[PDB]
């Protein structure tokens, strides 16, 4: 049996694993580029298989600067494996980026807003296509080699903190679930943590609209935005288009910014 993956790619390293999958960095032999390749073992459940096959077809249609870039998808039956070849991001994701910036000086307003705008625009792209993310969190947000923000479903398991209340309670939901996730991410970008204990305590309070007093005073506009985004009632949350048009996102600049 000839394995498509082993014939066409030189394996470099394992990047991690999560859910049905394992992810590898591998060099394509013919084109000489390095790719991220997710190998998903298809489950012994027809409805879960149905979903997986739908999801791969749906991602193959997607093209946006803030969405992870697709190359190929294929099946191998040596257990059936689905391989998905995407553009290789940097190893450190948004979660790691925030854990390496634990002071207020390292979270300058315009830098965080620039990053948040990229995420929000990726989300708005999905919503405009009648899609949603459902699982938006910092560990699902990576960077390209040139620091362009990339949203995907990375599935590297090393959390329900960013999940809307309607999902946590297992109720039906709408694209508005992603707006709830964005609210928490915006807060987290602007508010650096020293310990994981502090992070969990504070983010839990923020979910319930309890804010650190020094955050409300420093960032009054962003405070209002986060409140609205974190409404318990999904209807009350603003559309992604209304967030990206907010005044705080105009003329964003910082020393070192591209172009
Ligand atoms: C450094 C590094 C580490 C891991 C990486 C993983 C990926 C990656 C790979 C290799 C494959 C797929 C994705 C991805 O984002 C996925 C996406 C996805 C989600 C939103 C936007 C774009 C893609 N989907 C839907 N699915 C999916 C496929 C089948 C079943 C369920 C989910 C995904 O796996 C994905 N993020 C890409 C680059 C990586 N770079």
Q: Is the domain covering 89-259 a CATH 1.20.120.450 domain?
A: no
Spatial separation of the C-alpha atoms in residues 244 and 118, rounded to whole Å: 9
The CA–CA distances, whole Å, from 204 to 196, 197, 207, 210, 211 equal 12, 11, 5, 9, 10
Fold of 1-88: Phosphorylase Kinase; domain 1 (3.30.200)
Please choose, from the candidates 186, 1, 16, the residue with its C-alpha nearest in 3D space to the C-alpha of residue 77: 1
47 burial level (CB within 10 Å; 0-12, 13-18, 19+): exposed
Angstrom CA distances, 209 to 21, 68, 111, 213, stand at 36, 32, 24, 12
Strands across the sheet containing 21-28 = 9-18, 21-28, 34-41, 81-87, 70-76
Are residues 180 and 230 in contact, defined by beta-carbon separation less than 8 angstroms? yes
Other beta carbons within 10 Å of 199: 17
**Quick one: tokens of 79?**
């257990």
Tokens for 192, please give them: 């650096």
DSSP state of 68: P
82 Cα nearest atom in ligand 1: 29
Residue 141 in contact with ligand 1 by CB distance below 6 A: no
> Any idea of the CA torsion for 112, 104, 157, 35, to the nearest 10 degrees?
50
- ∠ at Cα 225 (224, 231), nearest 5°? 90
From the list 168, 173, 163, 159, the residue with the least C-alpha distance to 230 is 163
76 lines ligand 1 (CB under 6 A): no
Q: Whose CA is nearest to atom 25 of ligand 1?
A: 55
Exposed e or buried b per residue across 157-183, where buried means at least 16 C-beta atoms within 10 angstroms of its C-beta:
eeeeebbbbbbeeeeebebbbbbbbbb
Residue 221 CB partners (closer than 8 Å, separation 6+): 246, 247, 248
For ligand 1, mutation pick of 35, 52, 86, 135 (most atoms within 8 Å of CB): 86
Spatial contact of 229 and 179, defined as CB atoms under 8 Å apart: yes
Measure Cα distances from 96 to 90, 91, 100, 213 in Å.
11, 9, 6, 26
Q: Which of 23, 153, 181 to mutate to test the pocket of ligand 1 (most atoms within 8 A of CB)?
A: 153
Resolution (Å units): 2.3
Beta bridge partners of 128: none
Q: Convert 93-115 to b/e letters by CB count within 10 Å (16 or more is b).
A: bbbebbeebeeeeebebebbbbb
- Asked whether this chain's domains 1-88 and 89-259 adopt the same fold, the reply is no
Three-state DSSP class for 59?
helix
**Segments making up each domain of the chain, as ranges:** 1-88, 89-259
Give alpha helix (H) positions in 191-239: 196-207, 213-218, 220-229
Task: Locate the ligand 1 atom nearest the alpha carbon of residue 151 and give its number.
Answer: 21
């Amino acid at each position: 049996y000839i394995s498509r993956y082993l014939t066409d790619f030189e394996p470099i390293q394992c990047l991690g694993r999560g859910g049905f999958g394992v992810v590898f960095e591998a060099k394509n032999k013919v084109d000489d580029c390095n790719y991220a390749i997710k190998r998903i073992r298809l489950p012994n459940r027809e409805l879960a298989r149905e979903k997986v096959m739908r999801e791969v077809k749906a991602l193959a249609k997607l093209e946006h600067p803030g969405i992870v870039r697709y190359f190929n998808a294929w099946l191998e039956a040596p257990k059936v494996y689905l391989y998905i070849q995407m553009q290789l991001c940097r190893k450190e994701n948004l979660k790691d980026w925030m854990n390496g910036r634990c002071t207020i000086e390292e979270r300058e307003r315009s830098v965080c807003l620039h990053i948040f705008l990229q995420i929000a625009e990726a989300v708005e792209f999905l919503h405009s296509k009648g899609l949603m993310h459902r699982n938006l969190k910092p560990s699902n947000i990576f960077f390209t080699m040139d620091d362009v923000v990339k949203v995907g479903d990375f599935g590297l398991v090393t959390t329900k903190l960013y999940m809307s209340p309607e999902q946590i309670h297992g109720n039906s939901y709408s694209h508005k679930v992603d707006i709830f996730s964005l609210g928490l991410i915006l807060f987290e970008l602007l508010y650096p943590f020293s310990t994981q204990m502090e992070r969990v305590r504070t983010l839990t309070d923020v979910r319930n609209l309890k804010f650190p007093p020094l955050f409300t005073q420093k960032y009054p506009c962003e405070y209002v935005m986060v409140q609205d985004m974190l409404s318990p009632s999904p209807m009350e949350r603003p559309e992604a288009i209304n967030i990206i048009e907010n005044a705080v996102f105009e003329d964003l600049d910082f020393p070192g910014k591209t172009v």
